Design a protein around this nucleic acid. Sequence first.
RNA 1: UCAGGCGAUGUUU
DNA 2: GCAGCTAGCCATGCACATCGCCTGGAATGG
DNA 3: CCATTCAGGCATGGCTAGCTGC
Lengths: 653, 1319
Amino acid sequence: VPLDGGRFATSDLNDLYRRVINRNNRLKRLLDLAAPDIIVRNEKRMLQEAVDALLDNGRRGRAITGSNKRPLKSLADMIKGKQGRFRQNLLGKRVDYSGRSVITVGPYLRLHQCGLPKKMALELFKPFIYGKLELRGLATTIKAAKKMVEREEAVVWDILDEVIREHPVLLNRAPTLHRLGIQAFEPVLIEGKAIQLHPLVCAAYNADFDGDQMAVHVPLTLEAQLEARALMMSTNNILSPANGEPIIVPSQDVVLGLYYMTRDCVNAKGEGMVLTGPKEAERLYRSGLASLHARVKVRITEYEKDANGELVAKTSLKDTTVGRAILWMIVPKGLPYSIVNQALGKKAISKMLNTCYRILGLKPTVIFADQIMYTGFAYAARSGASVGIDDMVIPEKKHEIISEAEAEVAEIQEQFQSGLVTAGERYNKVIDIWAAANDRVSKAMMDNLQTETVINRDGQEEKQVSFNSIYMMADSGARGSAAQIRQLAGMRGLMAKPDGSIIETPITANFREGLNVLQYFISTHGARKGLADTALKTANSGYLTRRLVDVAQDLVVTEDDCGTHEGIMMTPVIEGGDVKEPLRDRVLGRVTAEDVLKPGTADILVPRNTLLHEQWCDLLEENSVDAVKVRSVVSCDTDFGVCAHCYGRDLAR
Amino acid sequence: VYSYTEKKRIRKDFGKRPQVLDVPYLLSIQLDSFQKFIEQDPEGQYGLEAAFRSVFPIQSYSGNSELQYVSYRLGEPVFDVQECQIRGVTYSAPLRVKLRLVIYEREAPEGTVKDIKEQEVYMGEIPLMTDNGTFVINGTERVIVSQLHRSPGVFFDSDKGKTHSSGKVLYNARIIPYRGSWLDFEFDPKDNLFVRIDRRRKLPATIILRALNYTTEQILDLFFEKVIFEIRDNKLQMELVPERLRGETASFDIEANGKVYVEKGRRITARHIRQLEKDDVKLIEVPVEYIAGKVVAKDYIDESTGELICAANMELSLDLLAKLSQSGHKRIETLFTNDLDHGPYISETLRVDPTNDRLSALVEIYRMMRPGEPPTREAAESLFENLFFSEDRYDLSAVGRMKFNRSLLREEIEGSGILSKDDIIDVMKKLIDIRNGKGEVDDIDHLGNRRIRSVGEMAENQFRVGLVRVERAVKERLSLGDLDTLMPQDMINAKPISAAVKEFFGSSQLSQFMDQNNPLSEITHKRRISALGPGGLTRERAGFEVRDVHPTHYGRVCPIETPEGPNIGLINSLSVYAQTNEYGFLETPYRKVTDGVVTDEIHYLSAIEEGNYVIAQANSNLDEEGHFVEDLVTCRSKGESSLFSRDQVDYMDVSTQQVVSVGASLIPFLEHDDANRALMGANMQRQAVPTLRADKPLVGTGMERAVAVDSGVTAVAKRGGVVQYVDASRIVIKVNEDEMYPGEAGIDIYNLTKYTRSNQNTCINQMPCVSLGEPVERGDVLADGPSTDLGELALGQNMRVAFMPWNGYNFEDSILVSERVVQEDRFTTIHIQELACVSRDTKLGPEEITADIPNVGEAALSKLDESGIVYIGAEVTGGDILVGKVTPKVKDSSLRVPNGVSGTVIDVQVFTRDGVEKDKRALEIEEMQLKQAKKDLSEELQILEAGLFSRIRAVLVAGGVEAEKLDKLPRDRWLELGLTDEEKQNQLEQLAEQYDELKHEFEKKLEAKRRKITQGDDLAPGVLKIVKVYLAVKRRIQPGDKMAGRHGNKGVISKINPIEDMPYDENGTPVDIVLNPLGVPSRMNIGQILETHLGMAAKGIGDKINAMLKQQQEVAKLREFIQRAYDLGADVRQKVDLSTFSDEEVMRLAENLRKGMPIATPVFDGAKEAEIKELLKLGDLPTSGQIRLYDGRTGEQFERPVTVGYMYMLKLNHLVDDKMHARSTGSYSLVTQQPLGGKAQFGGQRFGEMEVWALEAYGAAYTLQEMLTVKSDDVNGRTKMYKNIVDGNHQMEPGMPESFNVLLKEIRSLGINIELEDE
RNA sequence: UCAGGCGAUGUUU
DNA sequence: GCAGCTAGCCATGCACATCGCCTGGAATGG
DNA sequence: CCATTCAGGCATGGCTAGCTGC
Ligand SMILES: [Mg+2]
Ligand SMILES: [Zn+2]
């Protein structure tokens, strides 16, 4: 390598061969004059040492250093190791036609398309642009065309649009855990220099917008374009191959939006009136003549498909809330109603989307997802849920509780001072008393928040669930939990110790009031412990994943049906406590082995070679089934593969 | 009372705890250490002196030739700081040393012959430290972090746990000197005591014991204790210290005075012992069987024939009893044992012993030290003598000796730097004692055992290495010296010394490239404390333990500031008040407690010293007279807090800040946030960028002033005085006579570093902030540096923000930013880049810099002068040419703008090795700088003389005043004006002599400077000229640049909305930034909300004032109002008596408030809710801190009252235009035909192993096939792909990966043979 | 165009 | 016993993707 | 400068030499 000037950064390989050759030649020379045996032996020794080094430095005693201190890099080096060829240029490698930048939000896209910066596109598609150019003859030769692009003249942008119009790209994020970590999209040309990505797929990428970077690749071969559009465009991953549940579950902003858009007040504008149609419902809410949310009777209409795949109309009156109806306006035809009648928490809307899918196919579900997002942001911003200090309500009896605990601890202290008890059980008494006090505190604060709302009703007074912003953000399921809002309002209680055991004097003060020094000092190492543990945990997990893939690599579903009669007996699992997994979810999606009979004997219920989807599973729950012998990959009788019917539903489809 | 400058903008201050000890200087570490490294100090004591007096004098090989030291001296730099940066050569200073070689006569005692005095021989230069603690190595600005590492001395560790899962614990002990080889003792689970040296192998410690010329009996006598049997007619009377048998049961019968006390099965009891010791007879009855279970102590031999009865280390038996009885030796020496008190460990190891003499001992020693050799006796002798007694190859520090003796409960703290038999033996005794469960192990983590070096230490150690390198050749030539016909400098060689020191500074795990983009960042990255580096440990060989914050970091090492990621708990920052002890430990201040009165006597304490006492926590009220208000109080004693009585206390805290670093003690309201976000916010704050304007953060913490002063990036006047001349370039101050020297009284000038380059390409700059003709006080601000304002630190700006979700545009954490902002240029910031284009003369000929270039555009050429280099001030974009460099073929190698980086060329630099044609533009530039510097020093002398004659006038006023003959005849003709010969006349002569001296020195400095600019400076070998350019981009803000608050609330601006669209208040003002509420209750950084409130309070006071003033209301109203505004609050130490100002002295305060009323907050003592509330109530804004808003889109009313206020946000320096990057088809790596890696190099991304997993996971096949072959490897197929593309035919053809081809070849190089079949 | 060394950045939950 | 056990010694292994910056083989007759 | 030179980990496992049976 010629560096700056007529010098060269030395390569260990060159140095090693050079050493060996010097040694060999001096030796061969000595085999012309018959030096004594001690000489020739020490010489041969040198040479053997040399060759040993060349093949595999280090493996034989102290590695011969190189320039300054380093174990200079040998051939065995150049193969093995985290930087050798196998792991550095064969498994994964660098790639042309690619770019990287910062991502952002842009909530105005349909989720089969993500933004893309204009400069970046132009630079990605230089070839195709040249092509279309000297097709339409606006240019003549390549060199000229290159200069054209350099100029960035007028026609070029139109042509670039033309080549974009249908050609997907792949987006990627670095710590690529699972199959979702790569997806496809269709470009839409944008100013600026950032990538606008549809806000749903953030959850899938596990990628917030706090500066994380994503990379884009471009397919070239026509095969690959089809590959992308048929197997990698986000409109086919709404179900994680991890488990059956969906993955395009909406998240924090939108869930807050819905939760506010559907929740009963008790006495607000526009009450008790009745409304013919969600249409006029929305009309009211925009007019401002009625609450966004107030109990009200309306007429609604729904469609079922109890027929042989054909819809049946019906309609009725319902008792509900304006906003709830307005929500209803969107839902596609074939769905029940009570689904969107309750408070619509996170799990709620998740299950909602799920059932939508597994009754009405795909296209309706996608379009439904997008409508959910739009309406969610709209009404959220309309509401304006904000945090403010006043929200975090310090409880009243907190001081009383903590003083009580103080006194009782002091009494235990006197008891030990009277030598009755021993340090161990003393310690134990104290930890337990603080635990119980903590519980009482948590009860108090959560009570106050959840139920505080108490207002008249055109009658006298009445309590109800609250509109306190923080409790709302919690109960939705958007962010936080009892744990975290507890650390806000009530005392955060107890903290660990460098040993891993626990302190003998808990934190007595929450975050609304400030901590005094020593408390905060403790909390420091409290946090830092996990904060540093996270790296080791990361690494160890990753090593696990690698090892797994390299051992279960070559298993492929090649044959169709081994046609056999084995199986295993799935039963729902219990730990003598309650059932912890219901047979429904443990069996759902796998394939029968021996035809199940009714508990009424000799009354065979399901043929022995069927696949259990929802309706059959529900029939199982009907007839209150015990356990099922079921086909499983562990026992298929294929050769170099695994027969489909022994594997089951392809989750994600 | 406040300084006039302070009066510019006083700051309101909450806070109760009265601060008694002010903040100390923030660079104590750097400056003190280095100032200590370089000084003319007597009596050795840690300097160049120390290293010298160590290494010298060098005596000959008895050739009577002694090379002695005399004295040293450091001259003055050939250059200075400015020109040094400009060129690139280091910033050093000559090293001149007085040595002297004397020669006696042979044949006699010290009969002298001759000496020679090579006065101040040169031995290569060492660098120096600017008065900002920064070095300058090669035009750069590097800094040496201070290292933390294990104190020398000795330690006693558990090694719990992994002990073979036998549930047992081991015990090791380590002696670790400051320079030499280590030493280790440890037990094996079979209770065997072993030593090792530097972790090679294991040997039985008795080996070294015997090695120190000891015998078996010597050793045993020394460790174990004596027990005597005495032969008699019968009953074998034994001697018994009673307490000896306090623990283990005596299975036989024991009587005294006939009276039995103990029998079989009788365990000895406390009353047993008491009555026995009351009896006190130590010649008592014994059986015979029990004795047989012992080990002989000494060595008995036959009565007459003296033949071996029994060697020591031998158990009793029948035959031994018989052969001693036939001797009848009335003395029997044995060694007591007690498994609960006293083990035979040593003697068992003695059993293990292979050898039995000093000689074979040392033999085995060498045989493990260096493997495989016949050991010469005296050779191994000298070797072992050379391990632990070399005055040179081995050394404890004085520090070592101290900590050592202290740990051994010795009495004194001085003596040998090397070991002793007594020392090692005592060590082993301590080890045994702990093995006996008395004496505690000692945790490493305890900062009573970590130690902080610094630059002083580093340079000293390295320099000493250099000297002992030279001394070899020194004594070589000396021993082979001639007859007096030589000279010292003949014998000496600066080459190795300079080599070592340069290697150290310019290349080290410590000496790192100083971050500079932000004043706080500088002053941090100077105080940092790392445990990496030489003589330390590695980024991977440390677990939970050394990372965790031991409970004694308190007040010494900040707990909450540390870079997360790979290395945590390794990059501690040194706390605010922390000081380096005399020895090197970290001591901290405390307040002395008398009987019941808190004296304001500060008092420093180390780590271990703190352990004894008990300390009161800062937040604790008191009755004005050192009386604690309560009588029980929380305190801490020994890693344990509790509540105590009143009389128990010892010492009290200093200030409620002393537990955090400057890296964190700016974060307002820290006391509310969690540690996680506290940390993240601290670092982000460290990464700010200087805006184009500073704007005094509304919500500060009173440390701002301190940091701004202590950094080096602002100008503090060294003497009080009066403004005499302001000018965007310079500032000129007349001094006050009371603080003036008689001679060269004169005045002072401060130049100002104008627009120039950081190490991070940010725009370091300075500005004046004083109007003409104004008083200034000794030690005050004059030149606000980058991101400074009127003397306080200011990083970002304050912005009217509002928490409310909005149409998704703030989905995860995405800030949304109104256009009002980007209009008013309040995040625009400057960047500078340095682009070089060297030129060489190499094979096939020389390069040239003509303006002519083949096959270019005259249009492009238009921006070039006839000399080739662009003018000063063009506006260039990408692709433009800056310098025409040509190659003999002839081919272009011109330097062009990097892609997509606009800007303007602000300055040019040219260098050319001497002996080469200075071309046209070079000459022009040279003459230009010449005129500049001439003007410069000329003006210096001119206005200096102006002031000097003014002072003359001042003098002539008294005594022989002559107004007419004064103001008329030329001021130079003031030698013979009428006045007496008073010392006033003498001082007139003083002024005149300094006049003439200014003249002459001005002359010589002019000349030398001319020659400096005239010469053609050096370069690398093989280069003709170098052309440096400077661009200057003006980055605006735009979608996708990380902004962030001071609480870890990160964010990425995403859409630039038009003024219409931002929500607006009921009164019209829009709101600038919109954050996302959903970000709070998880990242529990609740602080930012309170910050926002208190902000709005401030700005409310503001608008009130601004209205009042635009009303042109009278001053009385303002006095009343502002006075109220400060006087509010429950209780403070602030006290501003606005009734004590002039009417000018106030209106200015108003006009500096009208943007807002800054507010302070000590870290753990700041404001509280009710206080903020009442402040707002003084304002005219609702208590709840929330408002009803309106939506510009619909002009309707949002439903719930939302939160607005002012947050102080920062623009980080991850800028989209540097992250964004792409590639179509660039170069290809040379060894493997793969694309390169990086942005700088026009490389491409890395499609990684996990992505390949991903594609296999989908059914995708063709895609992966492509992205492994066509896009990447095959030369052939790659090109053919490109062709098929441009011809509009999307289709590939595989080929085989060249990389795999390479793998094959490498294996085939190894002895293997891998092939490829063919079916 | 090569290997190091430094920091820094993201993976918080 | 020679069969089996057990202790000690050493081989093997420890996320991914960036972005700056810098700094380099050098020594020794003649 | 051109010819020739040369000092802190942790877990697991797999083995090899003793240790010591019954
Ligand atoms: Mg992130
Ligand atoms: Zn099967």
